């Protein structure tokens, strides 16, 4: 219902706020092959973390969609939810893109530094 959607959302946003912060405080790509390997490894682990939380993110977005389409909510409640989902989707997609670009650069670095 609305209550269980709000609780799922809070949990997802708490996780995501820390995932964004963790991603932001990664060191810039090193020139040493052994350091780039550790950074490649750390980022691969983070990419699986992101992966594992995808279904919780989809769940909250699905729950919010159902609640809005079912027509049982107040105009204010539908306002709040639309705003919540909009913001969540924006941040989730932004983190997806950024982390994928990070992975590409680390991948290209590791290969170049090994050849
Ligand atoms: Mg209404």
Author numbering: 310 to 424
Sentences reproduced from the published study:
Utrophin (Utr), the 395 kD autosomal homologue of Dys is widely expressed in non muscle tissues (reviewed) but is restricted to the myotendinous and neuromuscular junctions of differentiated muscle and is located at the sarcolemma of developing fetal muscle.
The Utr N-terminal spectrin repeat 1 (Utr-SR1) crystallised with two molecules in the asymmetric unit of the P212121 cell and has been refined to a final model with crystallographic R and Rfree values of 0.200 and 0.235 with diffraction data of outer limit 1.95 Å resolution. Helices A and C are straight but helix B has an appreciable bend in the centre with the loss of canonical main chain n+4 helical hydrogen bonding for residues Utr 360–361.This bending of helix B, a conserved spectrin repeat domain structural motif, is stabilised by conserved side chain stacking interactions between H362 and W324 (helix A) in combination with W401 (helix C) augmenting the hydrophobic heptad repeat central domain core. H362 is not strictly conserved for Utr/Dys or homologous repeats often replaced by Pro, that is also accommodated within the helix B bend. Curiously the Utr-SR1 (and Utr-SR1-L) structures are the first single spectrin repeat structures determined by x-ray crystallography in the Protein Data Bank; the single drosophila α-spectrin repeat 14 structure has been determined but crystallizes in a domain-swapped dimer conformation rather than the isolated three-helix bundle fold and Dys-SR1 is disulphide linked.
